[PDB]
Amino acid sequence: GPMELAHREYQAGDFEAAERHCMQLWRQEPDNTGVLLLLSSIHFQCRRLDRSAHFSTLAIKQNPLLAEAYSNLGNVYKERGQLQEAIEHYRHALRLKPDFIDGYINLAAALVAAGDMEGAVQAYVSALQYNPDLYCVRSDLGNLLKALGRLEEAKACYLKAIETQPNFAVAWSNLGCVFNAQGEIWLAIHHFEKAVTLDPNFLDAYINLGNVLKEARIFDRAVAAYLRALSLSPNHAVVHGNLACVYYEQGLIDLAIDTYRRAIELQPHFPDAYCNLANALKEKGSVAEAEDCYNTALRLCPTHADSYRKALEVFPEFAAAHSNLASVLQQQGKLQEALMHYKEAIRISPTFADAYSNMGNTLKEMQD
Amino acid sequence: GPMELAHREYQAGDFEAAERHCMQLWRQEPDNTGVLLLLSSIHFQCRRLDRSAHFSTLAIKQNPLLAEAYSNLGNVYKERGQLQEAIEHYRHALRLKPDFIDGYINLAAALVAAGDMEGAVQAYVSALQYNPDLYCVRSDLGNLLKALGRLEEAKACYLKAIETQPNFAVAWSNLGCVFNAQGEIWLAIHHFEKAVTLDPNFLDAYINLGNVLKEARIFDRAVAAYLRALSLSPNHAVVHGNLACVYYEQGLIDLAIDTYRRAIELQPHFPDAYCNLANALKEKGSVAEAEDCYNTALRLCPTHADSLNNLANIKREQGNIEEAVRLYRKALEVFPEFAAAHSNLASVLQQQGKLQEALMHYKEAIRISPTFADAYSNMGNTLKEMQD
Ligand SMILES: [Ca+2]
């Protein structure tokens, strides 16, 4: 019947001819469930949820064993942010039909949105069980795993996804991030480079690639990548602050001062960006306009806590503070404890002169 | 009901002891296949090719179905250099005993050592069907596979041998060389890194690591390597001649100068090293000496294209164009795929107004390295001068 025309207009995005043909039909065969189904679906592609859940309900009132109809209702519920009800409907529709892949996917979605990470992954495994070719779902699953700390399991979904669809940059980039978190630098670089080689316009691939080469200390390469990132997104505030950093390490204290600032303009929040500029100013030869920058950053927030025990409680292994705190504790009869603090400070920062110099005195004030 | 107190001591590495017990064991029981075989293994171990193969002959006269008997006998033939003799003994020993692993292995060596490579490949394969956990035997397969081009296969092997033995250092490095040869700079280095994290004295590991960091132009690191590699092998010439280039690359022209001279010491016949020392001199101004090294380099290797092409440059800069062209032409004869030489000449021609004959070489040097920016600029100019 017009089911042909309907399915046509609907395929052609021409949602109005669709809805027309449908009502026509429905008014002749009030039982055509696939129609009340199509309708529901249509009013959904038109943000018209109420009319969507309405026809979904008509479908059920004509046949309570339609897995799809409870899915559709589940979809109208998820958007209205009504997660419990979305889930409740997805689970039923899956009871009526255990091989309904779309339901498993919708449900995973609502589940994660609702907090249940474990359920979500159980749904993806089911989904993948029935259709191991959905490489995107593999990936999404891999993400949830990574999100939960199961990197090796994540590493597997990604590899499997790549295996299922060799040409799929997202995968490699995600797989590259797993390796990075694992300290497997050369591997991260390899995947990122591969991600990028696959989709040149892959912004984040370029940012991540630059970040690893940065950490690896391979600056020229680290740069070439950051630049290529900025060309794809001239406004990325963080990239600047990082690119600048590679410039300051490379030995261009000037361009750092230049680029560090511009970064701030992009987002006057970057605290690290200010203090980094302060240290860059000290080298340039301007201690005065360096300290203000230090304050500026410092003033913006107590986040870093540089502004002792509390700063220590915040910053683990902050040699500087371990030295400061130790001095006071030492010039207070509590040398024995300061000694342990300096010791720790010197264990943190091998080249902390004042620390060996302070401890030598503390250990000498213990003999007296 | 035999007297086996003889094999106990034998196993300890106490040949004579065994030999003594044995001798008497046969004296009473002149059919000690086990004694004769043990005897032959001993002698062979201690380089007694003649005695070794003698007891073995006996153990065969007695029990002819002794695989290990023919294998030991063949081992001696191989050692002597007689591969045909040794190959049939290994084959027979296998007909008799199919599950005879040392039989397959020993076969592989001799086969490779002879010529058949796919044959020695089979031996390795079967020997692995009987005991898949013999990893050191997996590598050797890959190595053999690699040298045969099939890298994807050899890769499978190294990949597996590591699965079997994760701490199998040589495994890594070797797999590393497959990625490098495949242009997988990042993997190739990643592996070469395990190869050394695991075994910190793995020379070839370092020499391989830096050799690749270098062609990726990651010179600081590539120096940490060769430095290491050289700490393990103080007089390794080739490693000097490569460290030198990494220096020259980072500006330190004087170090490279010394270094290249060191590497030449540890290897008089070292063209490439000369032809590079020259390059170094040529840039420090010492263009006289520079011309001398390229002279030597072309003395040692009358066909050294880079020495050819680079000496022509020095000649073009002395007005010596005709000659500069003879050299540019000799270097293109020794290597028709020489992008550089192709434009270098295409420049001397363009400077003489021989534009058409200059396009010819600029086209041919671009088709040989589509990334040649310089040859693109020049050919751009010539085409213009032909249109004004
Ligand atoms: Ca003209």
Q: Is A268 helix (H, G, I), strand (E, B) or coil?
A: coil
* Spatial contact of A106 and A92, defined as CB atoms under 8 Å apart: no
Query: Within 13 Å of residue A17, how many CA atoms lie on the same side as its CB?
Result: 13
Q: Does B187 touch chain A (CB under 8 A)?
A: yes
Which residue is associated with the tokens 């080689």? Answer: A197
Q: At what angle are helices B101-114 and B136-146 packed, to 10 degrees?
A: 20
Contact B31, B62 (CB under 8 A): yes
Three-state DSSP class for A19? helix
B134: part of which helix (H) or strand (E)?
none
Nearest partner of B95 among B126, B55, B135, B57, judged by Cα: B126
- B340 CA → ligand 1 middle, Å: 26
Q: CB contact, 8 Å: A249 with chain B?
A: no
Q: How far is A253 from chain B (nearest CA, A)?
A: 21
Tell whether B49 lies on the interface with A, counting CB pairs under 8 A: no
Q: Is the dihedral of CA B101, B107, B113, B117 positive or negative?
A: negative
Domains of chain B: 1-388 (1.25.40.10)
Is residue B348 exposed (0-12), middle (13-18) or buried (19+ Cβ within 10 Å)?
buried
Please, what sign has the CA dihedral across residues B152, B156, B161, B166? positive
Measuring CA to CA, which residue among B240, A236, A126, A96 is closest to residue A106? A126
B224 to chain A, any CB pair closer than 8 A? The answer is no
Q: How far B157 CA lies from chain A's nearest CA (Å)? A: 20
Burial profile B52-86: b = 16 or more Cβ within 10 angstroms, e = fewer: bbbbbebbbeeeeebbbbbbbbbbbbbeeeebebb
The answer to whether the CB of B76 falls within 8 A of the CB of B44 is: yes
Integer Rg of chain B from CA: 30
Structure tokens at B41: 């293994």
CB-based contact A190 B193, cutoff 8 Å: no
B156 to chain A nearest CA, in Å?
A: 17
Are A321 and A311 in contact by the 8 Å Cβ rule? The answer is: yes
CA-wise closest residue to B212 among A246, A192, A186, A223: A186
Q: Pull the structure tokens for residue B314.
A: 């020095």
Beta-carbon neighbour count of residue A252 at 10 Å?
15
Q: Is B190 on the interface with A (CB under 8 A)?
A: yes
> CA-to-CA distance for A113 and A134, rounded, in angstroms?
21
Query: What's the CA gap between B105 and B137, in Å, rounded?
Result: 8
Burial class (CB in 10 A: 0-12, 13-18, 19+), B211: buried
The C-alpha angle with vertex B338 and arms to B337 and B341, in degrees rounded to 5, equals 145
Measure the CA–CA gap between A146 and B288, rounded to whole angstroms: 63
CA distance A90 to A111: 10
Ligand 1 centroid vs B320 CA: distance in angstroms? 26
- DSSP of A280-304, one letter per residue? HHHHHT-SHHHHHHHHHHHHH-STT
> Are B186 and A184 in contact (CB < 8 Å)?
no
Q: Residue B255: how many CA atoms within 13 Å on its side-chain side?
A: 13
Q: Which residues of A touch B217 (CB under 8 A)?
A: 220
* Burial readout B7-18 (b: 16 or more C-beta within 10 A, e: otherwise): bebbeeeebeeb
Burial (CB count <10 Å: 0-12, 13-18, 19+), residue A118: exposed
Nearest residue on chain B to A189, alpha-carbon basis: B186
Chain B contact present for A136, CB below 8 A: no
Q: Determine contact: A186 vs chain B, CB below 8 A.
A: yes
CB nearest B187 (choices: A190, A218, A221): A190
Q: Which residue of B has its CA nearest to A184?
A: B190
Distance CA A329, CA A309 (A): 11
The pair phi, psi for residue B195, each rounded to 5°, is: -40, -25
* Cβ burial, residue A164 (10 Å; 0-12/13-18/19+): middle
Q: Which residue is closest to A190 within chain B, CA to CA?
A: B186
Residues A174-182: contacts with CB under 8 Å, at least 24 apart: A174/A139, A174/A142, A174/A143, A174/A146, A176/A208, A177/A146, A177/A208, A178/A146, A178/A151, A178/A154, A179/A155, A180/A208, A180/A212, A181/A151, A182/A151
Quick check: helix, strand or coil at residue A173?
A: helix
Interface of B with A in 166-185 (CB under 8 A): 184
Look-up of token digits 């534009």: B355
Residue A262 tokens read as 């511009």
Q: How far is B381 from chain A (nearest CA, A)?
A: 30
Distance from CA of A280 to the nearest CA of B (A): 24
Is B101:B69 a contact under the CB 8 Å cutoff? no
Backbone angles phi and psi of A316, in degrees to 5: -80, 130
